[PDB]
Amino acid sequence: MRLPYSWLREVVAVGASGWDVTPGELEQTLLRIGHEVEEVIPLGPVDGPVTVGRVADIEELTGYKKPIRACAVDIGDRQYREIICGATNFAVGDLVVVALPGATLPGGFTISARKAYGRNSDGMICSAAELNLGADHSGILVLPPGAAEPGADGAGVLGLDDVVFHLAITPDRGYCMSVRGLARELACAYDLDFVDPASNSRVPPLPIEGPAWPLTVQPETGVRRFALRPVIGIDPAAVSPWWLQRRLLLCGIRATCPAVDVTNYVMLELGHPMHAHDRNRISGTLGVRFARSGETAVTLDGIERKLDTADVLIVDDAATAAIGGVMGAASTEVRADSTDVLLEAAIWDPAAVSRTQRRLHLPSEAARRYERTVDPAISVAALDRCARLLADIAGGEVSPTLTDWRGDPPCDDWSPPPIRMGVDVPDRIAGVAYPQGTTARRLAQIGAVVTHDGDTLTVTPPSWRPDLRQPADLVEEVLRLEGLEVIPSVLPPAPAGRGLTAGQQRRRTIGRSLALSGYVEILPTPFLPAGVFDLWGLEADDSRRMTTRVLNPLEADRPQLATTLLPALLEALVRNVSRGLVDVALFAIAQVVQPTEQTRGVGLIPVDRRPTDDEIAMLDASLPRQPQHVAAVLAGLREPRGPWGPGRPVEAADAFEAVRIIARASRVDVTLRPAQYLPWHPGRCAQVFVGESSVGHAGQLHPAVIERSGLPKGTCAVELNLDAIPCSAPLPAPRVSPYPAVFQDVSLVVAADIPAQAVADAVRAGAGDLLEDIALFDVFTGPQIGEHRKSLTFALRFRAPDRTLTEDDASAARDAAVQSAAERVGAVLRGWKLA
Amino acid sequence: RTIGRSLALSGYVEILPTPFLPAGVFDLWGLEADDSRRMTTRVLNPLEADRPQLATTLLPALLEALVRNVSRGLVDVALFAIAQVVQPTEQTRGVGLIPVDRRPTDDEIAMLDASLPRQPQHVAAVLAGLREPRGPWGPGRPVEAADAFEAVRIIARASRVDVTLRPAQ
Amino acid sequence: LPSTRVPAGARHPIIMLAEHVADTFIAMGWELAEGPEVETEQFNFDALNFPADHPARGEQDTFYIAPEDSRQLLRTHTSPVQIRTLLARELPVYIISIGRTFRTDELDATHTPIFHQVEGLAVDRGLSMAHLRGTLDAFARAEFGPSARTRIRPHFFPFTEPSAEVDVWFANKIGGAAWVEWGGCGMVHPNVLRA
Amino acid sequence: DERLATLRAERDAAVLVAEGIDVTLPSTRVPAGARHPIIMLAEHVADTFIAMGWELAEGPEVETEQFNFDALNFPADHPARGEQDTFYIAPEDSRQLLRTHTSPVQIRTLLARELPVYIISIGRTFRTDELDATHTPIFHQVEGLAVDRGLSMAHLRGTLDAFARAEFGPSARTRIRPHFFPFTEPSAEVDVWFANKIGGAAWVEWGGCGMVHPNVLRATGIDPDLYSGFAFGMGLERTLQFRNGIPDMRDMVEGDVRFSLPFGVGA
Numbered sequence A: 001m002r003l004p005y006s007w008l009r010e011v012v013a014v015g016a017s018g019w020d021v022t023p024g025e026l027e028q029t030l031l032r033i034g035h036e037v038e039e040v041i042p043l044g045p046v047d048g049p050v051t052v053g054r055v056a057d058i059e060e061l062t063g064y065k066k067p068i069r070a071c072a073v074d075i076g077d078r079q080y081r082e083i084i085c086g087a088t089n090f091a092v093g094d095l096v097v098v099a100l101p102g103a104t105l106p107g108g109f110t111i112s113a114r115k116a117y118g119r120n121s122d123g124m125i126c127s128a129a130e131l132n133l134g135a136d137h138s139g140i141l142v143l144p145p146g147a148a149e150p151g152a153d154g155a156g157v158l159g160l161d162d163v164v165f166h167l168a169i170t171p172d173r174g175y176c177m178s179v180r181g182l183a184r185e186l187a188c189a190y191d192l193d194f195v196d197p198a199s200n201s202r203v204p205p206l207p208i209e210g211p212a213w214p215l216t217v218q219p220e221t222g223v224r225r226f227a228l229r230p231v232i233g234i235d236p237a238a239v240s241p242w243w244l245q246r247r248l249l250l251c252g253i254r255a256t257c258p259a260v261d262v263t264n265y266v267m268l269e270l271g272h273p274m275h276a277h278d279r280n281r282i283s284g285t286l287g288v289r290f291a292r293s294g295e296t297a298v299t300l301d302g303i304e305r306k307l308d309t310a311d312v313l314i315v316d317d318a319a320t321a322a323i324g325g326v327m328g329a330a331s332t333e334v335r336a337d338s339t340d341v342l343l344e345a346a347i348w349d350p351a352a353v354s355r356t357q358r359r360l361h362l363p364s365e366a367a368r369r370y371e372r373t374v375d376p377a378i379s380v381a382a383l384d385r386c387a388r389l390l391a392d393i394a395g396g397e398v399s400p401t402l403t404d405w406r407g408d409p410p411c412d413d414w415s416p417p418p419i420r421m422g423v424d425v426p427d428r429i430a431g432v433a434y435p436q437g438t439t440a441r442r443l444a445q446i447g448a449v450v451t452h453d454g455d456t457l458t459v460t461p462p463s464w465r466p467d468l469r470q471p472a473d474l475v476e477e478v479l480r481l482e483g484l485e486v487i488p489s490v491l492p493p494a495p496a497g498r499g500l501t502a503g504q505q506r507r508r509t510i511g512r513s514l515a516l517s518g519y520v521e522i523l524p525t526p527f528l529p530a531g532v533f534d535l536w537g538l539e540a541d542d543s544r545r546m547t548t549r550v551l552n553p554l555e556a557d558r559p560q561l562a563t564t565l566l567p568a569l570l571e572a573l574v575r576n577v578s579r580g581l582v583d584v585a586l587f588a589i590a591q592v593v594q595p596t597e598q599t600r601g602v603g604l605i606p607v608d609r610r611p612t613d614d615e616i617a618m619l620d621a622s623l624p625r626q627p628q629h630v631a632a633v634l635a636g637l638r639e640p641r642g643p644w645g646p647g648r649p650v651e652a653a654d655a656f657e658a659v660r661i662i663a664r665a666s667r668v669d670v671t672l673r674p675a676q677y678l679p680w681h682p683g684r685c686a687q688v689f690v691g692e693s694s695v696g697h698a699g700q701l702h703p704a705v706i707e708r709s710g711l712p713k714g715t716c717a718v719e720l721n722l723d724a725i726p727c728s729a730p731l732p733a734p735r736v737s738p739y740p741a742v743f744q745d746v747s748l749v750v751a752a753d754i755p756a757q758a759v760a761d762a763v764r765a766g767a768g769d770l771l772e773d774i775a776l777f778d779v780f781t782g783p784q785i786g787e788h789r790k791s792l793t794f795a796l797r798f799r800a801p802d803r804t805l806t807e808d809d810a811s812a813a814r815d816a817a818v819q820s821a822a823e824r825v826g827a828v829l830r831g832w833k834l835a
Numbered sequence B: 001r002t003i004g005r006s007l008a009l010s011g012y013v014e015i016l017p018t019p020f021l022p023a024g025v026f027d028l029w030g031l032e033a034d035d036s037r038r039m040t041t042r043v044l045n046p047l048e049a050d051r052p053q054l055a056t057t058l059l060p061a062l063l064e065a066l067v068r069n070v071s072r073g074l075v076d077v078a079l080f081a082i083a084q085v086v087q088p089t090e091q092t093r094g095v096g097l098i099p100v101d102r103r104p105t106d107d108e109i110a111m112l113d114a115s116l117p118r119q120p121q122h123v124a125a126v127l128a129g130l131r132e133p134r135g136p137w138g139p140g141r142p143v144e145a146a147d148a149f150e151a152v153r154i155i156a157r158a159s160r161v162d163v164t165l166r167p168a169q
Numbered sequence C: 001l002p003s004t005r006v007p008a009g010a011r012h013p014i015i016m017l018a019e020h021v022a023d024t025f026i027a028m029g030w031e032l033a034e035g036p037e038v039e040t041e042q043f044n045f046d047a048l049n050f051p052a053d054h055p056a057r058g059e060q061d062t063f064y065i066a067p068e069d070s071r072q073l074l075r076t077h078t079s080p081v082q083i084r085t086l087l088a089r090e091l092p093v094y095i096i097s098i099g100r101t102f103r104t105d106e107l108d109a110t111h112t113p114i115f116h117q118v119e120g121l122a123v124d125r126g127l128s129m130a131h132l133r134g135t136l137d138a139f140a141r142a143e144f145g146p147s148a149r150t151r152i153r154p155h156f157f158p159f160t161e162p163s164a165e166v167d168v169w170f171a172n173k174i175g176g177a178a179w180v181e182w183g184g185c186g187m188v189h190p191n192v193l194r195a
Numbered sequence D: 001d002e003r004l005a006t007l008r009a010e011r012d013a014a015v016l017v018a019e020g021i022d023v024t025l026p027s028t029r030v031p032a033g034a035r036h037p038i039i040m041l042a043e044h045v046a047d048t049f050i051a052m053g054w055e056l057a058e059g060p061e062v063e064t065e066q067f068n069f070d071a072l073n074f075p076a077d078h079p080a081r082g083e084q085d086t087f088y089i090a091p092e093d094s095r096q097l098l099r100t101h102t103s104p105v106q107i108r109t110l111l112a113r114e115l116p117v118y119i120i121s122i123g124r125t126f127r128t129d130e131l132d133a134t135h136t137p138i139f140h141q142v143e144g145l146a147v148d149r150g151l152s153m154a155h156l157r158g159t160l161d162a163f164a165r166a167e168f169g170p171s172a173r174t175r176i177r178p179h180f181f182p183f184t185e186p187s188a189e190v191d192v193w194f195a196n197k198i199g200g201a202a203w204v205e206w207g208g209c210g211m212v213h214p215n216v217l218r219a220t221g222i223d224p225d226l227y228s229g230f231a232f233g234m235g236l237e238r239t240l241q242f243r244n245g246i247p248d249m250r251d252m253v254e255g256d257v258r259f260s261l262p263f264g265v266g267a
């Protein structure tokens, strides 16, 4: 909302004459009581000969791209100057504003008598924007007849010493979308007496003698008030005086004709939107009703609107007269020939206006005020104010008839219910001991009726403050007018908290451990890439395809939420690689979204109580499962090149080691088992287990997936479900025998299909507790042991808890380990030695 | 905390270092008679008569833990410690009793502090044997000086500072 | 000679900022709570005193889960976590919720549709705006240095009353200390407590 | 062309099995290390108290007699000030020693900071005990001190119970019995109810506590008629010994990697 300081000042000055403040101080006062000042715009300075002129001749220059005019302009004292101008929105006889040689316009533009378009031009005719007066629109500024004489000083006529304040009003303060509301706020901030410009001393009531027009209202439309009053015999050729056109311009409204200008003007002054109908274009009774399915209306911009059954209309016998509270209709619109006007002062349902205008994308000046609730007590004051102004400007007569529907039954008292509050509640909420009388004084200032009864205040807010419903609402009024800056800064005592949960600590430890091992964390987008699971070649019934879908994604082809973190990680990997960073290891820790059913919403639970435990469980059960995952991808060199050697390319074993890094960080033991699971390579894919629970997969990606997706060759990947890895808090008590150890190596031949870990497990089971350590040294294949067999050499370390092991006790334990391997995996002993 | 986490992830095992120096350690090291590390605070009543000197350097305690691991057959070891040392700047000087019916003054506090040996925090590490173990990937890789330089870099990254290394004797 | 054969990685700077924020509040006795990013409309809007026809409940600002009118969405703040925590735990409650939140902003230099928020809620007997300011100043000192502090100006949010915007005095640097808008605050609205 | 592709496919599928690996082979070429279990216990203790608003303070292990004994209300001829229990710095009567507790850190903190003060001091302390299964001359202690207006024994018990729950589980709690220390009055010994395990829940002695003695407040310039304070201390090696069931303290101090590695990295 835009308004000029002069207007605001004039309204404040009625009750406090002489009041006047600098723009900087006004800005600061508005910020501290809660109004955001987006911009302070002093009307840009002019200097030198910028004066009113009168166009006395127009010659059309031909031959150029555009139409161009050479104008004789009267600039005062019977002096005429030739001026070239490209605008077309003016005629001979019009008052305009000329910047003549020697003048300077805002932005440092000096005017000189240049030669333009073949003729000499002694200056220019100015637009409102070139004067920094108002919005840049097509054509130059034309002042209304009689506004000033040729030669009058531009700065003074235009009022260029004004300042326009551009505010962003919050939706709880609809009453501030007008000079009435902001001036009242200023009166509160500065402790002034305030004269309400909507009051009866300032808007004396007009006569009330018979209905102004037949009206039916279906009350379930939520209309609260609907008043009409006619003005007859206005001159359709009259234009608004300059003072009115100017204020409209500074508030961002272009003047068009008095009947419309006056409704816009009174809207800005008092905050009650107003509309002017051509009464001779109304056919029969005016009806307020909901639209029907499929119904259409043409608004006064000539655009056809598809209506909704929740849209409230004004109709007559023949057509729609308005989309109520949003925009008037073409059929009753004031036109160039309109002589008899019916003025509409209505109060619509805020939510109804809010839904309708957003559906139609019509955030009009009226709609935005009705959305935030317009004061229903001033409809006839605004109607009367607006009829007088129109009759005076356009030379009509105000008819003494008035329709004023005030509900079924009529409502004669508009203020909200009384609110009841302890006198010191604001002091407690603020942590400030305000002087006595403070909250009652501030609550009267904003217009409430306040009565005292011991220590409890009863507060009845005014009708323009529908936001004041509870004690907290009143606290805010007291605190913001006192100023939040007086509230001290006092650290509370927070309780003895328990710190981070075990899960929270684990997710920190996993991140630290992966980062130290060379992985770089990314923040993964939950919006899956288009067609990713077809690139992966997943089966139609793969659970990962069962995705929750977003209705309004920013990219139409990416509406599916991620069931797996790998797509986001591979997308970051491709990005790094395409920028020349080809040796990369990335990880992410984030939830996924895994629905178990079709989207099911749970109906509104009443908010005047807490939901029950069963309602909470039902809300939870309606959501997709959202477990925490950890995942990582690797490509390129795992070990970089340097003086030590050529480096080492990423291999599947690096993904297995990432599993082990995460398991150590989680303090759990994992086992890895061969698996076939896209998008992994079937021969280089491990499924990961904690106990007998599957927690995810790791290994090298499938070469066909790599190739279809444009991934680096040999890319490896890991994804684990953190929710499936049990919590663990071990309390170790390691036995540390100091007696000497015995070292032996053993080589065992097994079928090639036997996993090395199964052999190690068997060796461990047979050797017993004397076996302190076992490590796989060598995997050897060759023709002399059989084409489908392999030799595994294990280093064994034996140690007794209470004595020096004999080398023969060690060999007894080795014999038992060999036998166990023989019985469990069919191992055959090839040889052993002392290490 | 960050230095300890970073060294532990890189394969080092933390020890709690004894502050009682081994007997004759700086003669074993061949230090000059005027080496500042020989200027030790001494304990009057140590549990071992021949170990009364408090450590000016953490390496002796770390090497003693290293020898212990190695003598028990754990020959591929990397140890670290984070602990204060004791570095006197003068002969033992006591400060007389300040009356306890009041608080000491700021000057008395500074005098008490100035009478104590400097006690800065050190981080140290020792490595021997295989840095990378033997396995199916190959024979492993013995500890080399470059592994000690990398420990410096691990500590510097953990500290968020840049270091440079310069030849020294 | 270079010695680094295992190059260092890096946790994400946003995660590390979140970690520092969390530690700042843990050290004052608060705890951290978490919740789902796909959330019910009940906890994202209704429990937070948004009117039924508030514009935030539309597709212009919020990602909704298909189909239409499913009352399921990507959360627009982490406040539903504090609602869940108020339902689950006994008073008094001092809870930080840090997490991923979603808005229909296009990605550009100063906007992202996926972002991370910290929100705090303290509910106890006799808490005031002064305690709010004290906690905000402690928070500011921890993230911007011992010379930082906050100021508040009146504003509006559906779930607080009174409501304010928070500026932080950013001394350490910026090219010349100035006030920077940091976020929003207020006293939790009685309707939120009732629900 | 029905079967150009079916066995062109099952050709490529056997290329994939021909390049299979044993996914169970060892992969760890940088073996994990380990922060020390006592350091990790200290870290958990510190976090427990940080999360209640306390802060951690540190100080020198070679300390003045002023802060180790005199400021702590030890009489001039108290036996603890002798060579039988305390390591003294040579020569004789130097008023310099290896600290026998971390309390001198709280004295230093009371001198340096404004009240109220809620301070944990964890650190290395020294006693002339021979190293054996349940003693070490070098050990680690946690001591806390809270000094504020209106602190009572009830607040002491609340902090002790919170501490116990954090280190021993939600079923733990503490009990106190009257005892004596020069720096507290009243003084008590703390037992912890060790439920989680032990082979059958029982009370275990954990450490000492009490209300800080008014002479300690006077020697730091604090008015004991306005401020009161509670204090407590426990040994980390002793706590680890009875909580984990570690029978030989020599393992905690000798530096064998086999003691540390089963506790994990500690990141």
Ligand SMILES: O=C(Nc1cccnc1)N1CCC(Cc2cccc(Oc3ccc(C(F)(F)F)cn3)c2)CC1
Pocket (backbone or CB within 6 Å): D072, D103, D104, D106, D107, D127, D136, D139, D141, D143, D144, D145, D181, D183, D184, D206, D207, D208, D209, D210, D212, D216, D231, D232, D233, D234, D235, D236, D237, D238
């Ligand atoms: O550790 C131990 N003994 C041990 C022996 C050998 C090996 N392992 C363990 N015990 C046994 C002794 C006991 C002493 C004690 C008693 C009461 C409160 C304490 O805490 C304080 C004291 C003073 C202050 C200050 F404010 F006045 F400064 C602040 N806190 C400390 C601590 C635990």
